[PDB]
Symmetry: D2
C-alpha cells in the first residue's frame, strides 16, 4: 500500500510533468498556426463549433466556455448526436475545431464530409501531422506532450492540459486583439 | 408491493392522461403564437438558443436536437453556466426560447436582462400569462395541461410532453414551410 | 406557399398522430416487460445508466431526470465518451438502458461487451425484436409507433414521445410501488 | 496586433499557467490531498461533482478522469440539481463542490441536501472563510496568485490549478488501488 510520503511524492511528480507540458508549449506548437487561429477567430462572423471524445471532449467544452466568455459564440458538438442530426448546428460562417490527440478518432472523422459540404473553416487540434484531421484541416494546430504522468501513459492528462492551455493563450490574446471590455463582460457574467 | 394488474392499471392511467394532454393542444396554445413562431424561426438568420431547468431543460434539449435536424441551428443554454459567461453565445439575430411551466423560474429570469441588451427575439414558453417570462416575451407561447398523472400533481410529465409536442408540430411544419429536402437531411444524418 | 390555415392544419395533424401513438402504448409494449422493469428498478441498489444517440439520447436524458426526481439515482452515458473511458461509470449493481429505435445503433452496440463483463442488468428499448439490443437484453422493452408525423418519416418525433411516455408511466407507478413521499421530493426540489 | 505581439502575449499566458501548476504544493493542503485519495479509494458509491461556468468544466474533467480509473462519477448541473437531479446524490457518495470564491449561490443551495443525505462533502475553493470551505468534510484548498487575462477575471490559471490538483489525485489512485491495463481496456474499447 501507500503511506503519506508515497502519496505526496506521486502527486508532486504529476504536477512537475503537467507544468513541464505547459512550459514546453512553444516547442510543440506552431507560431503560424497560433497567429492564424487568433486572426481567423477575431474575424469570424459565425460561431465556433468544437467536437471531441472523452478527455478531448472536456478540453473541447473548456474552449466553448471560454470563447463565449469573450463574446466569441461557441457550442459543443457531441459526436454521437452530430451524425444523428446535430451537424445541422454547423454553418458556412462557422469554425469547426476537432480535438483528437492521434488525429484519426473515428467519431470526429465522420464529421469532416459535412464540414467540407457546409464550407466551414476546419481547425485540426492534434499531435499527428500525418493524421486525417491534420491533413484535412484549413488550420493544422499542432499540440503534443513528450511525457504523460499516469503509469500506463494512457490517461492523456498532460495532453489535455496542453490543449486547454494553448486555447487559453489564444482566448487571452483575443481579449487585447478585439479590445474586449469590462462592460461586455458584465452583461454575460451577472451571477 | 403491488400486483401485476395494479401495475398495468396505474401505467394505463398515465398514458391516457398524457395522450389527453397532447390531444388538447389546440385548446391550450395560441394560434397567433404558433404561426408567428413558425414564421420567425423560418426567417431566422442566427440560431435558436433554448434554456430550461430540470424537466424544462430536457424539453429544451429536445427542441435543440429537432431544430438542428431540420437545418435550424440551435443550442442549449445551461442556466448555471449562462450567468457565469455562456450568455456570450446569445447574439442579436438569435431567438432565445425560455421554457418554464410557472414562468417565474429565477434561473431563467436572470437571463432576460442580457436578452434585452443583446436585442434577441424572446419566445416565452409557459402556462402562466401573468408571469415575467410571459410578459417580457416578444412571442408569448402559451402551453398548459389540466391534469398531471403522478399522485402529487408535481412531476410535470404531461406538461413536458405538451411542450415537446408543441414544438414537434412547429418543427414538422417548418419542414414543409421551408421546403426541407432529404438531400439536406442526409448531410447531417450520415450515421456512425 | 402555405397560408395560416395550412400552417394550423399541418400542426394539428402532428398532434393527432402524437396523441394516437401514446394512446396505443398498451398494444405496442409488453405487459411482462413493463412489470419486470418496475420491479427491477424498485429493487436496484446501484444506479440507472441510460444511453442513446440524437433523439434517443434526449429521451434517455428525460428518463435520467425523472428517475432522479423519485430517488432512483440515474446518469446519462454519452456514447462518444463511453468508449473513451466513461463506461467506468457502469457497475455490477447498475441497470443499463440502451434506447435505439432499430436496435442496431453501432455507438450503443459498442457498449454491450462492457455491460456483459461488468455484470450489469441490460434493458433494451427498441421496436425491433430481431435487433442486437433486443436479443442481448436481460429485459427486452418493446416500444413502437405505426405512423410518424413528419413528411419523410425520419424525425422519429412520435417514436421519441412513445419512449418517454413509456418510462413516465414506469416512473409514476414507482412512486406508489416504493411509497415515495413529498418529504423526499422537497429535499431534492428546493427550487 | 503584429506576429511578435501575438506570440509575446501567448507566451506570457503559458508562463503564468505553468507557474500556477508548479506552485501547487504551496497552495494545497497535504492533509487534504492524502484524505481525498484515501476517501475516494474507499468509496463504495459514486463521486458527484458540481460547478458553474469554468468551475463546471473543471468538474466535468474530474468526472471523466474518475470514470477512466473505475471510480464512478457524475456531473451535477446546479440549474437541474435544485429541480430534482439532487436525487442522484446518495449517502455513500462523495459530493465535490468547485467554487473559486466558495460562496457561489447555486452550489450553496446543494449543501442542505448533502447534509440530509449524509454524503461526504469535499469543498474545492481558494477561500478558507467561505461556506463551501466551512461546511466541507474535506476542505480542499487550491489557489493561484497570478491570472494571465488583462482583467484578472477569466480564471484560466485557477481552472488549470483545480484540474491539475485532481489529475494528481487520480494518477495517485491508479497506483494506490492497483488499477490495471485490463480494467482500462474494458472501458476504452474505442468507436470501431
Amino acid at each position: 500500500g501507500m503511506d503519506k510520503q508515497a502519496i505526496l511524492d506521486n502527486i508532486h511528480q504529476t504536477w512537475q510533468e503537467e507544468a513541464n507540458a505547459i512550459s514546453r508549449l512553444p516547442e510543440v506548437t506552431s507560431e503560424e498556426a497560433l497567429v492564424k487561429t487568433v486572426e481567423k477567430i477575431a474575424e469570424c462572423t459565425g460561431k465556433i463549433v468544437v467536437a471531441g471524445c472523452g478527455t478531448s471532449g472536456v478540453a473541447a467544452k473548456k474552449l466553448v466556455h471560454s470563447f463565449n466568455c469573450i463574446e466569441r459564440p461557441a457550442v459543443f458538438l457531441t459526436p454521437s448526436d452530430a451524425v444523428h442530426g446535430t451537424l445541422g448546428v454547423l454553418q458556412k460562417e462557422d469554425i469547426l475545431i476537432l480535438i483528437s490527440k492521434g488525429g484519426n478518432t473515428g467519431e470526429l472523422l465522420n464529421l469532416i464530409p459535412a464540414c467540407k459540404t457546409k464550407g466551414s473553416t476546419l481547425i485540426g487540434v492534434t499531435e499527428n501531422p500525418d493524421s486525417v484531421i491534420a491533413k484535412e484541416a484549413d488550420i493544422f494546430f499542432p499540440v503534443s506532450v513528450s511525457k504523460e504522468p499516469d503509469p500506463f501513459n494512457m490517461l492523456a492528462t498532460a495532453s489535455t492540459m496542453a490543449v486547454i492551455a494553448s486555447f487559453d493563450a489564444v482566448i487571452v490574446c483575443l481579449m487585447t486583439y478585439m479590445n474586449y471590455t469590462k462592460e461586455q463582460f458584465s452583461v454575460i457574467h451577472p451571477g
